[PDB]
Write an enzyme that holds these catalytic residues in place. Structure first.
Site, short mmCIF file in Angstrom:
data_model
loop_
_atom_site.label_atom_id
_atom_site.label_comp_id
_atom_site.label_asym_id
_atom_site.label_seq_id
_atom_site.Cartn_x
_atom_site.Cartn_y
_atom_site.Cartn_z
N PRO A 124 0.77 -1.25 0.00
CA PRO A 124 0.00 0.00 0.00
C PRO A 124 0.80 1.30 0.00
O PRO A 124 2.02 1.31 0.12
CB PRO A 124 -0.85 -0.13 1.25
N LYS A 137 3.05 -7.18 3.93
CA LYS A 137 3.70 -6.89 2.65
C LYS A 137 5.16 -6.51 2.86
O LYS A 137 5.51 -5.96 3.90
CB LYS A 137 3.00 -5.73 1.96
N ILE A 178 -3.92 -2.81 -3.03
CA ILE A 178 -4.51 -3.73 -3.99
C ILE A 178 -4.95 -4.87 -3.07
O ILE A 178 -4.16 -5.72 -2.67
CB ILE A 178 -3.47 -4.23 -5.03
N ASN A 194 -9.27 8.09 3.93
CA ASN A 194 -10.05 7.48 2.86
C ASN A 194 -9.32 6.22 2.41
O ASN A 194 -8.13 6.25 2.09
CB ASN A 194 -10.21 8.43 1.68
C1 LIG Z 1 -18.81 15.41 5.62
S1 LIG Z 1 -20.09 15.36 6.75
N1 LIG Z 1 -17.62 14.68 5.81
C2 LIG Z 1 -17.68 13.81 6.99
C3 LIG Z 1 -17.62 12.34 6.57
C4 LIG Z 1 -16.59 12.07 5.50
C5 LIG Z 1 -17.01 11.75 4.21
C6 LIG Z 1 -16.08 11.45 3.23
C7 LIG Z 1 -14.72 11.47 3.52
C8 LIG Z 1 -14.30 11.80 4.81
C9 LIG Z 1 -15.23 12.10 5.79
C1 LIG Z 2 1.44 -1.67 -1.08
S1 LIG Z 2 1.97 -3.29 -1.16
N1 LIG Z 2 1.63 -0.78 -2.15
C2 LIG Z 2 2.12 -1.46 -3.36
C3 LIG Z 2 0.99 -1.60 -4.39
C4 LIG Z 2 0.12 -0.37 -4.50
C5 LIG Z 2 -1.23 -0.44 -4.18
C6 LIG Z 2 -2.05 0.67 -4.33
C7 LIG Z 2 -1.52 1.86 -4.81
C8 LIG Z 2 -0.17 1.94 -5.13
C9 LIG Z 2 0.65 0.83 -4.98
#
Ligand SMILES: *C(=S)NCCc1ccccc1
Ligand SMILES: *C(=S)NCCc1ccccc1
Ligand SMILES: *C(=S)NCCc1ccccc1
Ligand SMILES: [Cl-]
Ligand SMILES: [Cl-]
Ligand SMILES: [Cl-]
Ligand SMILES: [Cl-]
Ligand SMILES: [Cl-]
Ligand SMILES: [Cl-]
Ligand SMILES: [Cl-]
Ligand SMILES: [Cl-]
Ligand SMILES: [Cl-]
Ligand code: NA
Ligand code: NA
Ligand code: NA
Lengths: 114, 114, 114
Positions: C1, C32, C64, C97
């Site tokens: 990641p 990983k 992934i 996120n």
């Molecule tokens: C608006 S009320 N944002 C609070 C929840 C949220 C939504 C999407 C991404 C992060 C946080």
């Molecule tokens: C974690 S193993 N990152 C390597 C693969 C990856 C996954 C999502 C976005 C970028 C790279």
């Protein structure tokens, strides 16, 4: 929701109260409590739109629900409006990516919204 | 499409004409009008790849369509090639997230592309 | 990641070795090799959470696979914990996120992971 704006406009041109205005306007637009809304402004960026470096902006709006055809059109009018009024960026030089997030994919306070 | 590159390479190492080259090359690669292409380069970032602070980049390419298995492999060859030649970043120290955006989820000019 | 943290806390407040700590902790959490993990920290940002500019952070974790209800709750506890301990950011002022990327949509080394 959370709103992020990246722009080549200089920091000195971002007026006092801009983050506050975005926060309140987004609360009214989505009907959500302003206490959970997050806003992020990134000025002085090296960017181009159509090959030109006149003022422009690349933004994103993430929300758990409240994302859709008509809603996004309304958000775009509101946000482009604010960027034009406050940062003097033409609406046709602004892109906003909208994301409808699953509650399980939004972490907060050591957990998620699921 | 819109392309964003975040890198620890210093601003002084980003050559003149870089944004212009990315714009033209992406236009050619996607068959999209250059007037719509947005590019954003963010140098001097605090980042690591594999725990190492050698030159690296985290990028994203958003597009309404023109995203897929073969196409993404071609964009990666193109983009990694440019980052290696212009910013001296090794291709194996570059990640590019691709997003095929629904037109309704891309705001522009007070509305969306839907 | 790959993990990205955008925050308003001062660059001087980011502990030396924080990037390495994030790298190793994420490697353990996902099983990983650290060689694949990318981390990006962006301090001194102009942002607000709930209208307040006290310390806060907007983050993202792209992977992934290994993304899900229980896993994301675990990652949130781990990441909020690190941000609280190292950057002194309260967990309730952090959003993360999560993105489960298809291998075909992740470019690397002139190609993709597909
Ligand atoms: C608006 S009320 N944002 C609070 C929840 C949220 C939504 C999407 C991404 C992060 C946080
Ligand atoms: C974690 S193993 N990152 C390597 C693969 C990856 C996954 C999502 C976005 C970028 C790279
Ligand atoms: C390339 S033609 N970009 C213009 C449309 C677009 C697509 C995705 C995200 C932002 C803008
Ligand atoms: Cl809608
Ligand atoms: Cl409508
Ligand atoms: Cl989601
Ligand atoms: Cl394809
Ligand atoms: Cl192929
Ligand atoms: Cl979409
Ligand atoms: Cl139509
Ligand atoms: Cl899970
Ligand atoms: Cl994906
Ligand atoms: Na979504
Ligand atoms: Na998509
Ligand atoms: Na996904």
């Amino acid at each position: 929701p959370m709103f992020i704006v990246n722009t080549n406009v200089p920091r000195a041109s971002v007026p006092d109260g801009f983050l506050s205005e975005l926060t309140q306007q987004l609360a009214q637009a989505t009907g959500k409590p302003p206490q959970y809304i997050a806003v992020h402004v990134v000025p002085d960026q090296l960017m181009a739109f159509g090959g030109s470096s006149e003022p422009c902006a690349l933004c994103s709006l993430h929300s758990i629900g409240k994302i859709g055809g008509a809603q996004n059109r309304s958000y775009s009018k509101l946000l482009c409006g604010l960027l034009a009024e406050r940062l003097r960026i033409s609406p046709d030089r602004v892109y906003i990516n909208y994301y409808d997030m699953n509650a399980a994919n939004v972490g907060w306070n050591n957990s998620t919204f699921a």
